[PDB]
Design a protein around this motif. Structure first.
Motif, PDB file in Angstrom:
ATOM      1  N   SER A  85     -10.052  -0.389 -14.638  1.00  0.00           N
ATOM      2  CA  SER A  85     -10.362  -0.836 -15.904  1.00  0.00           C
ATOM      3  C   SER A  85     -11.460  -1.872 -15.596  1.00  0.00           C
ATOM      4  N   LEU A  86     -12.730  -1.835 -16.362  1.00  0.00           N
ATOM      5  CA  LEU A  86     -13.640  -2.565 -15.827  1.00  0.00           C
ATOM      6  C   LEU A  86     -14.514  -3.142 -17.121  1.00  0.00           C
ATOM      7  N   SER A  87     -15.237  -4.114 -17.266  1.00  0.00           N
ATOM      8  CA  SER A  87     -15.862  -4.698 -18.252  1.00  0.00           C
ATOM      9  C   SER A  87     -17.794  -4.828 -17.873  1.00  0.00           C
ATOM     10  N   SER A  88     -18.500  -4.529 -18.828  1.00  0.00           N
ATOM     11  CA  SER A  88     -19.943  -4.882 -18.821  1.00  0.00           C
ATOM     12  C   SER A  88     -20.329  -5.767 -19.869  1.00  0.00           C
TER      13      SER A  88
ATOM     14  N   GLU B 267      -8.878 -10.499 -12.194  1.00  0.00           N
ATOM     15  CA  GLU B 267     -10.389 -11.008 -12.295  1.00  0.00           C
ATOM     16  C   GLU B 267     -11.250 -10.038 -11.044  1.00  0.00           C
ATOM     17  N   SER B 268     -12.457 -10.106 -11.318  1.00  0.00           N
ATOM     18  CA  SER B 268     -13.433  -9.485 -10.201  1.00  0.00           C
ATOM     19  C   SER B 268     -14.772 -10.392 -10.345  1.00  0.00           C
ATOM     20  N   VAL B 269     -15.258 -10.303  -9.456  1.00  0.00           N
ATOM     21  CA  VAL B 269     -16.604 -11.010  -9.275  1.00  0.00           C
ATOM     22  C   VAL B 269     -17.643  -9.825  -8.901  1.00  0.00           C
TER      23      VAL B 269
ATOM     24  N   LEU C 187     -18.102 -13.925 -13.073  1.00  0.00           N
ATOM     25  CA  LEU C 187     -16.773 -13.470 -12.858  1.00  0.00           C
ATOM     26  C   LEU C 187     -16.491 -13.115 -14.523  1.00  0.00           C
ATOM     27  N   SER C 188     -15.407 -12.152 -14.260  1.00  0.00           N
ATOM     28  CA  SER C 188     -14.603 -11.621 -15.477  1.00  0.00           C
ATOM     29  C   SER C 188     -13.148 -11.769 -15.199  1.00  0.00           C
ATOM     30  N   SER C 189     -12.424 -12.408 -16.102  1.00  0.00           N
ATOM     31  CA  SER C 189     -10.936 -12.577 -16.068  1.00  0.00           C
ATOM     32  C   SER C 189     -10.402 -11.776 -17.336  1.00  0.00           C
ATOM     33  N   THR C 190      -9.287 -10.785 -16.956  1.00  0.00           N
ATOM     34  CA  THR C 190      -8.836 -10.361 -18.107  1.00  0.00           C
ATOM     35  C   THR C 190      -7.419 -10.646 -18.275  1.00  0.00           C
ATOM     36  N   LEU C 191      -6.911 -11.075 -19.625  1.00  0.00           N
ATOM     37  CA  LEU C 191      -5.412 -11.057 -19.791  1.00  0.00           C
ATOM     38  C   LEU C 191      -4.818 -10.169 -20.531  1.00  0.00           C
TER      39      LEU C 191
HETATM   40 CL   LIG Z   1     -13.059  -6.681 -15.571  1.00  0.00          CL
END
Ligand SMILES: [Cl-]
Ligand SMILES: [Cl-]
Ligand SMILES: [Cl-]
Ligand SMILES: [Cl-]
Lengths: 212, 218, 194
Positions: B181-184, A160-162, A174-178
């Motif tokens: 890796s990131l997301s928008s 995750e990242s904020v 916040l985005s959480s990736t599985l």
């Molecule tokens: Cl992300």
């Protein structure tokens, strides 16, 4: 060794209010304590040294006081540019910095809007499956995300990242990736993201069924 | 007019040696201690050690003794921080700062702008861009997943900069593979999923990679 | 400025004196004046106690700062270089007339250190090294003793082969291989006998 402890870890205030930051030492120490301010993407700036003397160019609203074990940084009335991380540093223990206090903007409690995104069909042709959970525009920052696969609690396979506190509404996202392999992803049916946050009266879940 | 200027960002591989530099201006460089300070990603500040460029007297923190060498060239007002064999865990931001006093201490009053060191076994690689399509549903969310690139940074805009309201671009995370890796994402009224077009514009200048990805509802 | 009629004299530790404003200054506070070694220092503060901070600059552009504790039982005199940040000397005098004075070298290390007891006798350390060693000299009522300093103890000696020492450690031990007003014994030549 002599240990510095800064309180609180997070101080949530608003422009116009008075801010007091604490640094405490495990033993009585000398006056050689310095305070720093660091904004995101910038180098630290010295504010106070020798516990109470202001550095050149530092605005008068900053002041330092204290002796022995208890030291205080006071900001008489906060301006918008004063919202940053603050570090103390003492002579003892080879000039060790304190862990830091984050001064953030206090706003109304706001529950997050929760969204789940299944892996794109293009990614699956590559062999990987990323499932994404979005928590949009919440406050305060404290939020727990728990992944559930066929109602089995997931662990050690998510990141995750904020974001930083938003400039106009003061909220966090916040985005959480599985991430699983395509073989493991095509083995289970229901994928669920469970969010816990004090603005919600109960935990909230978003989910989907694979293939639907 | 008193200032410290550090050398530029470094992308290295583990095992390589590296020497970064800190140049002083506007004051007697050999009259003051110069210190080096580490800040790992998302962490606080760590005092590493100091050198007196007048005679290269060097004092290290017990946490960094034997892990680094601090040196100085008195004749060009430059201090140096060096490793003989970089580790992945050496990935961090490094500041130099003027250190005031040994048996007294008045803090570190002049700082360089910092030098980023990235240490990875990875090689330069452009990202892959996957859609995050809106679900069945009023506010809707849609986005782009920008996966497996190196090194940082990558830039994401929406509809060539015409859509800015409600956009969140997340900090990148480092995956187990050594790739970033990131997301928008962006929140839009669900009223406009049939009419308004949504394209995310991803640019990775280290690899000269420009990707435009149309995000459609299923 | 401030004189006999517009101020009150306050006795400070270290036989210094400070004058304080009568009622209050133009913009809220009391004004403070104290002259230290040819140089008069000016300072503003509340409290009307005598406490506060006073600063000044010497002819050689060195900066002086004098802080007075709130209970007026302690005094700190710092001398800085022209940058106002490089410490040249720092002396702390206590109400009981005792004091410690540190002199720093060009590196910011204590290279000289003078410790004054309440009786007036001084313990002077010169040429201090990063080892923790240096020269040791005890100034007494009449005579001077000279010796060496180690990070462990302090040894003072007077010298035929009859040459015995005087030991003072980190704490207040005093062993001889003795008086509380630090001395019967008399003056310098007269030590060699016994
Ligand atoms: Cl992300
Ligand atoms: Cl449960
Ligand atoms: Cl609630
Ligand atoms: Cl100088």
């Amino acid at each position: 060794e002599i240990v510095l402890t800064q309180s609180p870890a997070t101080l949530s205030l608003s422009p116009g209010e008075r801010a007091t930051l604490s640094c405490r030492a495990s033993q009585s120490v000398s006056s050689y304590l310095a305070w720093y301010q660091q904004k995101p993407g910038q180098a630290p700036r010295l504010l106070i040294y020798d516990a109470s003397t202001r550095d050149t160019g530092i605005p008068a609203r900053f002041s330092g006081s204290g002796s022995g074990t208890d030291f205080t940084l006071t900001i008489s009335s906060l301006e918008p540019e004063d919202f940053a991380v603050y570090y103390c540093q003492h002579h003892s223990n080879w000039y060790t910095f304190g862990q830091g206090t984050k001064l953030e903007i206090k706003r109304t409690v706001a529950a997050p809007s929760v969204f789940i995104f299944p892996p794109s069909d293009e990614q699956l042709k590559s062999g990987t499956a990323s499932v994404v959970c979005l928590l949009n525009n919440f406050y305060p920052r404290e939020a727990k995300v728990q992944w559930k696969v066929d109602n089995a609690l997931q662990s050690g396979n998510s990141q995750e990242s904020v974001t930083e506190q938003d400039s106009k509404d003061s909220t966090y996202s916040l985005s959480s990736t599985l991430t699983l392999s395509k073989a493991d992803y095509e083995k289970h049916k229901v994928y669920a993201c469970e969010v816990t946050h004090q603005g919600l009266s109960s935990p909230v879940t978003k989910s989907f069924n694979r293939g639907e | 007019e008193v200032q410290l200027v550090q050398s530029g960002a470094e992308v290295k591989k583990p095992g390589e040696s590296l020497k970064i530099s800190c140049k002083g201006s506007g004051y007697s460089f050999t009259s003051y201690w110069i210190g080096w300070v580490r800040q790992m990603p998302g962490k606080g500040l760590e005092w590493m050690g100091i050198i007196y460029p007048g005679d290269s007297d060097t004092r290290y923190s017990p946490s960094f003794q034997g892990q680094v060498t601090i040196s100085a060239d008195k004749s060009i007002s430059t201090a140096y921080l060096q490793w003989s064999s970089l580790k992945a865990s050496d990935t961090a931001m490094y500041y130099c700062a003027r250190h005031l006093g040994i048996d007294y201490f008045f803090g570190m009053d002049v700082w360089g702008q910092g030098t980023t060191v990235t240490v990875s076994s990875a090689s330069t690689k452009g990202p892959s861009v996957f859609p995050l399509a809106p679900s069945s549903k009023g506010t809707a969310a849609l986005g782009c997943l920008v996966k497996d690139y190196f090194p940082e940074p990558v830039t994401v805009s929406w509809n060539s900069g015409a859509l800015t309201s409600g956009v969140h671009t997340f900090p990148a995370v480092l995956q187990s593979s050594g790739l970033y890796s990131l997301s928008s994402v962006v929140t839009v009224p669900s009223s406009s999923l049939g009419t308004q077009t949504y394209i995310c514009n991803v640019n990775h200048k280290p690899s000269n990679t420009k990707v435009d990805k149309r995000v459609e509802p299923k | 400025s401030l004189d006999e009629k517009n101020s009150v004299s306050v006795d400070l530790p270290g036989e210094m004196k400070v004058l304080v404003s009568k009622e209050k200054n133009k913009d809220g506070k009391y004004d403070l004046i104290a002259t230290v070694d040819k140089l008069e220092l000016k300072g503003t503060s509340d409290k009307n106690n005598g406490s506060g901070v006073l600063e000044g600059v010497k002819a050689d552009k060195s900066k002086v700062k004098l802080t007075i504790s709130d209970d007026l039982g302690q005094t700190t005199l710092e001398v800085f270089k022209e940058d106002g940040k490089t410490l040249v000397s720092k002396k702390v005098t206590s109400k009981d007339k005792s004091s410690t004075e540190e002199k720093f070298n060009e590196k910011g290390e204590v290279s000289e250190k003078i410790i004054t007891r309440a009786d007036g006798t001084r313990l002077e350390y010169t040429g201090i090294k990063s080892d923790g060693s240096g020269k040791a000299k005890e100034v007494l009522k009449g005579y001077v003793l000279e010796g060496t300093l180690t990070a462990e103890k302090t040894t003072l000696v007077v010298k035929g082969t009859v040459t015995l020492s005087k030991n003072i450690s980190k704490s207040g031990e005093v062993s001889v291989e003795f008086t509380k007003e630090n001395t019967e014994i008399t003056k310098l030549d007269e030590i060699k006998n016994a």
